[PDB]
C-alpha cells in the first residue's frame, strides 16, 4: 500500500524518536598503568591485551 | 485408517474382489475406518459369476488395516493390506468364508460370525 496522507510532524517525530542509539555500559580496566573505560563485555579482552585502546 | 475412495480387498467369498469406500458409517463427518468400522462401499472388481456384481453398493466391515491400530494393553496390530468383509444389515458376512486374519476389534464390535469364520483372529 501507499501512505494516504502526509504524516503530521507530531506523529513523524513521535515515532522517529524511537530510532535512538543505546549508550554502551562502560567499566574501568587498568592497562599499562592507565585506567581506561571498556564495555564489561570486553573487560577480559582488555585485561588480556586483546582490545585496541589506541 | 480407511477413508472415502480408499480401495479395500474383500476378505470374503462373495465374488467381490475389491471395494471402494463410499462412506464411513458411525456419525456425520466420520473420517476414518479402522478394524471393526463399517463402511458403505462399491464393488470395483468382482468374480464374473457370483452373488455380488461389479458396481454394487454394499456394506462392509474393515477386518484388516495397514495403519497400525493401538490396543488397550499398549500393543498394536498392523496388516499388509486393507481388507473388509461384506456384511448385511444383520452385521453378518454376506459370504460364508472369511480369508486371511482379522483383528479382535471385530469381536469387540460383535462381528462374532466374522470372528468365528476367520481362520485366525489376532
Amino acid at each position: 500500500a501507499v501512505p494516504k496522507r502526509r504524516m503530521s510532524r507530531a506523529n513523524t517525530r513521535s515515532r522517529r524518536a524511537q530510532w535512538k542509539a543505546e549508550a554502551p555500559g562502560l567499566v574501568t580496566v587498568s592497562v599499562a598503568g592507565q585506567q581506561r573505560k571498556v564495555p564489561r563485555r570486553l573487560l577480559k579482552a582488555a585485561r588480556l591485551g586483546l582490545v585496541d585502546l589506541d | 485408517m480407511i477413508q472415502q475412495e480408499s480401495r479395500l480387498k474383500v476378505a470374503d467369498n462373495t465374488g467381490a474382489k475389491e471395494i471402494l469406500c463410499i462412506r464411513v458409517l458411525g456419525g456425520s463427518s466420520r473420517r476414518y475406518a479402522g478394524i471393526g468400522d463399517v463402511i458403505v462401499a462399491t464393488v470395483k472388481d468382482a468374480i464374473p459369476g457370483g452373488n455380488v456384481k461389479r458396481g454394487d453398493v454394499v456394506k462392509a466391515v474393515v477386518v484388516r488395516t495397514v495403519k497400525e491400530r493401538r490396543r488397550a494393553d499398549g500393543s498394536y496390530i498392523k496388516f499388509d493390506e486393507n481388507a473388509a468383509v461384506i456384511i448385511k444389515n444383520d452385521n453378518d458376512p454376506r459370504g460364508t468364508r472369511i480369508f486371511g486374519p482379522v483383528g479382535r476389534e471385530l469381536r469387540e464390535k460383535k462381528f462374532m460370525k466374522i470372528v468365528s469364520l476367520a481362520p485366525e483372529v489376532l
Partner: protein, 118 residues
C-alpha cells in the same frame, strides 16, 4: 556436538561443516584465532571434541580426527602436542574471549584460544 539450532553458520550445512573444519585447523595451528563470536561459539565444542580424540591417542582416534581436519600437519600437531598437553585436563580445552566488533559490519568478534595455564 549439539547441532546449530538456527540457520547454519556458513549459509548451508556443508559450508558450516567446512567452516568448522577450517576454524579447528587454524586454532590447532596458531593456538588462538580471532573470528566472529558465533563462529567461536560453534567451534569451541567442535574443537574440544577433536582435542578429545587427540587425547585418546590411537590410530582410530587419528582416523576420526582426519575425517574432519584433512590437514596431516595439524593432525600430527594435535596427536603429538595438544593431546599430551591436555592429558591431565578434563574438558574445557578452549577459551572464548569476546573482543571488539568489526568496523565493516559491527559483527561480534571473539578470540578463541587453546587453554595453556597448566
Amino acid at each position: 556436538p549439539k547441532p546449530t539450532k538456527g540457520p547454519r553458520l556458513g549459509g548451508s550445512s556443508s559450508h558450516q561443516s567446512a567452516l568448522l573444519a577450517n576454524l579447528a585447523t587454524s586454532l590447532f595451528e596458531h593456538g588462538r584465532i580471532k573470528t566472529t563470536e558465533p563462529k567461536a561459539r560453534a567451534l569451541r565444542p567442535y574443537a574440544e571434541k577433536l582435542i578429545t580424540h587427540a587425547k585418546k591417542g590411537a590410530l582410530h582416534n587419528r582416523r576420526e580426527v582426519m575425517k574432519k581436519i584433512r590437514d596431516k600437519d595439524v593432525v600430527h600437531t594435535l596427536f603429538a602436542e595438544i593431546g599430551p598437553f591436555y592429558a591431565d585436563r578434563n574438558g574445557g580445552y578452549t577459551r572464548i574471549i569476546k573482543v571488539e566488533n568489526r568496523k565493516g559490519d559491527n559483527a561480534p568478534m571473539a578470540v578463541i584460544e587453546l587453554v595453556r595455564e597448566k
